[PDB]
Design a protein around this ligand. Structure first.
Ligand SMILES: [K+]
Ligand SMILES: [K+]
Ligand SMILES: [K+]
Ligand SMILES: [K+]
Ligand SMILES: [K+]
Ligand SMILES: [K+]
Ligand SMILES: [K+]
Ligand SMILES: [K+]
Ligand SMILES: [K+]
Ligand SMILES: [K+]
Ligand SMILES: [K+]
Ligand SMILES: [K+]
Ligand SMILES: [K+]
Ligand SMILES: [K+]
Ligand SMILES: [K+]
Ligand SMILES: [K+]
Ligand SMILES: [K+]
Ligand SMILES: [K+]
Ligand SMILES: [K+]
Ligand SMILES: [K+]
Ligand SMILES: [K+]
Ligand SMILES: [K+]
Ligand SMILES: [K+]
Ligand SMILES: [K+]
Ligand SMILES: [K+]
Ligand SMILES: [K+]
Ligand SMILES: [K+]
Ligand SMILES: [K+]
Ligand SMILES: [K+]
Ligand SMILES: [K+]
Ligand SMILES: [Mg+2]
Ligand SMILES: [Mg+2]
Ligand SMILES: [Mg+2]
Ligand SMILES: [Mg+2]
Ligand SMILES: [Mg+2]
Ligand SMILES: [Mg+2]
Ligand SMILES: [Mg+2]
Ligand SMILES: [Mg+2]
Ligand SMILES: [Mg+2]
Ligand SMILES: [Mg+2]
Ligand SMILES: [Mg+2]
Ligand SMILES: [Mg+2]
Ligand SMILES: [Mg+2]
Ligand SMILES: [Mg+2]
Ligand SMILES: [Mg+2]
Ligand SMILES: [Mg+2]
Ligand SMILES: [Mg+2]
Ligand SMILES: [Mg+2]
Ligand SMILES: [Mg+2]
Ligand SMILES: [Mg+2]
Ligand SMILES: [Mg+2]
Ligand SMILES: [Mg+2]
Ligand SMILES: [Mg+2]
Ligand SMILES: [Mg+2]
Ligand SMILES: [Mg+2]
Ligand SMILES: [Mg+2]
Lengths: 101, 24, 150, 50, 76
RNA sequence: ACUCGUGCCCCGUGUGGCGAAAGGGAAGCCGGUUAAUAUUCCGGCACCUGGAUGUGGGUUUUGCGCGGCAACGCAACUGAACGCGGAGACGACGGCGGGGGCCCCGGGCAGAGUUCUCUUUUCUUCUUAACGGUCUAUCACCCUGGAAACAGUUUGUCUGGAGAUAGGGUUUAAUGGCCGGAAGAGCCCGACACUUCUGUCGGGUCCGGUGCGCUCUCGACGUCCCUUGAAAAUCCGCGGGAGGGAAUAAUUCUCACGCCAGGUCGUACUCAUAACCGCAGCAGGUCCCCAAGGUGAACAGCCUCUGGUUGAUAGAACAAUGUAGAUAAGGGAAGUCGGCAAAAUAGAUCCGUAACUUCGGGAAAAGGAUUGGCUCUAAGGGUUGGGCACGUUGCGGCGUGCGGUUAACAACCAACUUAGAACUGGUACGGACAGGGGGAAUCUGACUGUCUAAUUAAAACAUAGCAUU
C-alpha cells in the first residue's frame, strides 16, 4: 500500500477569525466520498488537524489533490467568503488560502 | 558516367603532370 | 481617441483574434500612446491589456446520450431514419464472420485438435452458408470427432 | 498581379511620378496662365492602357 | 548533427583545425553530460552518464579550445 | 603540341530558332523580429552544382579488392571508340489492407466557470522541423525436399511435378520505434522588482484506449473497351578491352575530412453585396487549396465553437389598393378555354402486390399495420495459460526424448448492431426539420442525348439498325 498526505493551510483567515478550522474539519468528514458513497471514511482516510490553522489528510487509496480543491471552494462558497479568499497551490500536495488585493 | 565528369579527371591529371615536372 | 491600431497590434502580440482583446476602459489616454509592438508588450505585462477566455461549449449531454444507448434506451423504431443496410451493411457482417471462422480453424489445426483432411472439408463448408456463428462450428466439430472415434 | 515583367514595372513607376500637383511658385511668374494640373489620373476613374 | 560513440575519437575530432568552439550541457533531471564541438560541416555530440569522467575529459581537451557551460535560459 | 596562333590527326546519314509562372525539372527547415517585408532580415542547424586541390584510409612485391552453395553483401576496389538496357513516362472505376493528421473515451498535475440543492463536476494547455544514424515493415527471389485420403488460401477461386505445404535465408519500400538536432526552444502557472531605462527568479511541460469514423498517401488484387490512355532535355548500369601504372614507391581509388564561388528580373496590397468586367461603391458574371461539435443514412435542413461582422437614410402612425406569409363553418370543381394556383401523399420496419411484356421489367404497382419514455432480459468478439524425464543458462529460457486432445476450462479486455418482456401518459410519439398523390385509356417519338444567349424545348435534330452509289 502507498500512502499520500495533503495539507491545507488557512493561517491568515484563522488569525483574523473569519475562517474556523473545526467546521472545516467537520465539513470534510461527512462530505468526502469513498467508492461512490458518503460516510464510508474508514481506515482509508485520516483527517487529523495539526492545530496552527492547518488540516492534514492521509490517504491509502487513490485520491487526487484536485478533488480536495473542489471541496474547499465549495466550503468557501457556502460561507460567502468567495469574494476575499482564493485557494492557490504553493508546492507539492499543499494548498494555501490567500487574500485578494 | 557523363562526359563532363570524365573531362574533369583527365584535366586534373594533365595539370598535376606539368606541375610535377615544374617541381622537377 | 481612436484605438483601432492598438487593438490590431494587441491581437498579433497575444496570438488571438481581435474579438478576444480587452482594453482597459479607464486608461484610454495611456493606451493611446502605445504605437510600437514593444509598448504593447509592456502594457500586457502591467495588466492593462488582457486576453479574454473562450465561450463555453460542453459535451455533457452528448456523452450522456451515448451511455444510455449502450443499454438500449433510444434505439426504437421511431428513432431510425436510414435503412437497415445503411446502419449496418451486410457485407461487413459477412466479412467479420468469415475472418472469425477462419481464425478458429487455423488455431485447432496448429494445436492438433484436427488434421488437414478435416480442416480442408470444414473450410469449404464455412465458405458456404453452413455455420451461423462460432458456437455452431464448435458443436459440429465435437460431433464429427465423436463419430470418428467409432 | 505580383508576377510582373520589367517593362510593365517601368511603366507603372512613370505613371505615379506624373501624378502630383503643380508647385506654388509657378503661379506667381509674369504672364502665367496655368491654374491646376489638367492631366490628373486616379485608379478609380480612368484606366491606363498597360 | 552526428553522434560520437567513444571518447578516443571525440578527442581526435577536437584536435582539428576547423574546430571553432565547444560547450558543455548538463541535464540534472536525467543525470547526463553532453559534450558538443562545432566544426565546419557538422556538430558532434558525445553523451556521458557518470560524472567522474567529465572533469577527466575536460582537462584532456586541448588548451586552445574555448569551452562554455550553456547557461539556462539563454538570452536572445 | 604550338619556341610563339600559323601546324598536324581522327569520325561523319542529317542539317535552325520561338513556343507551358497548372506538363517534364539539382538544392532549406525551426524559433524570433516591423507601423508596414520575410521558407528572402537575425540566431541556430543543413543541403546542391561547378571549380581547384592536400591529408587519412584502400590496392599493387607474380599489376587493376575480399566474403557467401545461392539470392547477394561490404568505406573504397582502372576502363577510350563503338553498342545494348533502365529511369524521366502516364486511363477511368470497385472493394480490401498499412501509415501520418483530425475527431472520440479514461487517469494525473496546474488554472478558470457554477455551487438555495446536485455534480470525485464543466472548460483550457500538456508540442517536437528539415537533415542524419540504427533496428524493422507487403510483393518478389534463393537453398533443402518431393505432394491423391490432393493440399495451401482471399470479403471477392486463384496457386502448385514448368516443383506446392513446411523449415531456413536474401532483398525493393518509412509519413514506424529509439538516438543526434533538443530543451538551451516554444507553451502554462507562481513570487518579487520596475516612473522610465529595465527586468529577475522559481515550478511544470506525463500515461493509456477505441473505430464499416473524416482527410491525404502507399500496396496487393479486380472490372471496361470495334476507346488501350504525350514528347524532349537530363542522369545511371552493363557488353567490349583502347591506353596507363609499384617494389619503394606508384595509384584518371564513384571512401572520409578539408579550400573557393554561385550573376539578372518579380516579391507591397485586393481577389470581390466597395480594390477585376458590366458608363458606378450595380442583388449580374469570373479558375483553385484547407474544412470542427450535436441530431441524422448523409457536404440535406436546424442549433453551436474558432475566426469574422453588427454594413446597407432614419423617426412616428396602422386608412384604401397592393407585394410576400397564412387559416376558415356546410358543400366539394357547381368556377374556368382548361383543376391555372393551392391542398392532399411522403422517413424506417413488417405484411401484400394485377393486366401486359422484347422475360430484363411493370414495382415504391394498388392496399394495410407499427413507431415516445422508463426498468430489464438474450445474442453476435479479442489476448494470455496448459503433463512428465534428462543437460546448459542468473522462477531460470531453452537443446531435446516423449505423452496428450482438458467430454473445452480459467483470468483479463471492448464498441456498436439486432431481437423480446413488464410498467407508464388527456391514444400521444419520422411530435421541429426533412419528406413520392394514385388508377383505366387514346395520339405521337423507340430509349439516354441536342438547339432558336433576350417571346416557341417540341411530335423538330442526332442516334444504333437497314438499303442504295
Ligand atoms: K515550367
Ligand atoms: K523593411
Ligand atoms: K595511403
Ligand atoms: K578493400
Ligand atoms: K505527362
Ligand atoms: K487508407
Ligand atoms: K487513415
Ligand atoms: K490515423
Ligand atoms: K468522432
Ligand atoms: K527538405
Ligand atoms: K498436385
Ligand atoms: K465485398
Ligand atoms: K478532394
Ligand atoms: K587493361
Ligand atoms: K513578399
Ligand atoms: K504577400
Ligand atoms: K489573383
Ligand atoms: K455532424
Ligand atoms: K448536418
Ligand atoms: K398596414
Ligand atoms: K394596407
Ligand atoms: K371543372
Ligand atoms: K370548353
Ligand atoms: K408514417
Ligand atoms: K386504334
Ligand atoms: K431525351
Ligand atoms: K425555346
Ligand atoms: K424538354
Ligand atoms: K432541331
Ligand atoms: K427498321
Ligand atoms: Mg450483396
Ligand atoms: Mg524556349
Ligand atoms: Mg511546372
Ligand atoms: Mg564540391
Ligand atoms: Mg565497363
Ligand atoms: Mg526525434
Ligand atoms: Mg530511422
Ligand atoms: Mg513458405
Ligand atoms: Mg532526444
Ligand atoms: Mg521550457
Ligand atoms: Mg499582409
Ligand atoms: Mg477570396
Ligand atoms: Mg458585384
Ligand atoms: Mg469597375
Ligand atoms: Mg450517428
Ligand atoms: Mg421606416
Ligand atoms: Mg394574398
Ligand atoms: Mg371550407
Ligand atoms: Mg369542415
Ligand atoms: Mg368528398
Ligand atoms: Mg399545379
Ligand atoms: Mg406504397
Ligand atoms: Mg402502371
Ligand atoms: Mg424523344
Ligand atoms: Mg428564346
Ligand atoms: Mg422557353
Amino acid at each position: 500500500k502507498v500512502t499520500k498526505k495533503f495539507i491545507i493551510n488557512a493561517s491568515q483567515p484563522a488569525s483574523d477569525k473569519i475562517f474556523d478550522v473545526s467546521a472545516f474539519e467537520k465539513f470534510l468528514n461527512e462530505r468526502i466520498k469513498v467508492d461512490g458513497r458518503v460516510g464510508n471514511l474508514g481506515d482509508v482516510i485520516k483527517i487529523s488537524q495539526i492545530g496552527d490553522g492547518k488540516v492534514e489528510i492521509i490517504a491509502h487509496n487513490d485520491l487526487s489533490g484536485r478533488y480536495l480543491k473542489y471541496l474547499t471552494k465549495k466550503f468557501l462558497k457556502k460561507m460567502q467568503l468567495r469574494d476575499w479568499l482564493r485557494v492557490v497551490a504553493t508546492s507539492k500536495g499543499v494548498y494555501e488560502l490567500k487574500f485578494y488585493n | 558516367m557523363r562526359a563532363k565528369w570524365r573531362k574533369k579527371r583527365t584535366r586534373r591529371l594533365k595539370r598535376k603532370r606539368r606541375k610535377v615536372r615544374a617541381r622537377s | 481617441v481612436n484605438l483601432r491600431t492598438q487593438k490590431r497590434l494587441a491581437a498579433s502580440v497575444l496570438g488571438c483574434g481581435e474579438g478576444k482583446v480587452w482594453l482597459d476602459p479607464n486608461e484610454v489616454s495611456e493606451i493611446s500612446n502605445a504605437n510600437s509592438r514593444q509598448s504593447i508588450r509592456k502594457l500586457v505585462a502591467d495588466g492593462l491589456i488582457i486576453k479574454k477566455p473562450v465561450t463555453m461549449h460542453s459535451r455533457s449531454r452528448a456523452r450522456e446520450l451515448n451511455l444510455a444507448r449502450r443499454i438500449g434506451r433510444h434505439r426504437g423504431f421511431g428513432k431510425r431514419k436510414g435503412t437497415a443496410d445503411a446502419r449496418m451493411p451486410q457485407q461487413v457482417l459477412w466479412m467479420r464472420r468469415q475472418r472469425v471462422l477462419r481464425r478458429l480453424l487455423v488455431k485447432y489445426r496448429a494445436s492438433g485438435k484436427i488434421d488437414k483432411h478435416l480442416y480442408h472439408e470444414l473450410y469449404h463448408l464455412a465458405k458456404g452458408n453452413t455455420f451461423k456463428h462460432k458456437r455452431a462450428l464448435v458443436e459440429h466439430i465435437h460431433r464429427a470427432k465423436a463419430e470418428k472415434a467409432r | 498581379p505580383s508576377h510582373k515583367t520589367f517593362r510593365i514595372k517601368q511603366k507603372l513607376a512613370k505613371a505615379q511620378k506624373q501624378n502630383r500637383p503643380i508647385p506654388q511658385w509657378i503661379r506667381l511668374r509674369t504672364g502665367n496662365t496655368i491654374r491646376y494640373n489638367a492631366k490628373r489620373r486616379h485608379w478609380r476613374k480612368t484606366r491606363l492602357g498597360l | 548533427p552526428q553522434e560520437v560513440s567513444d571518447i578516443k575519437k571525440f578527442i581526435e575530432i577536437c584536435r582539428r583545425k576547423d574546430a571553432s568552439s565547444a560547450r558543455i550541457k548538463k541535464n540534472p533531471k536525467t543525470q547526463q553530460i553532453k559534450f558538443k564541438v562545432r566544426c565546419q560541416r557538422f556538430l558532434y555530440t558525445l553523451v556521458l552518464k557518470d560524472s567522474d569522467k567529465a572533469e577527466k575529459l575536460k582537462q584532456s581537451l586541448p588548451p586552445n579550445l574555448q569551452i562554455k557551460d550553456v547557461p539556462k535560459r539563454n538570452k536572445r
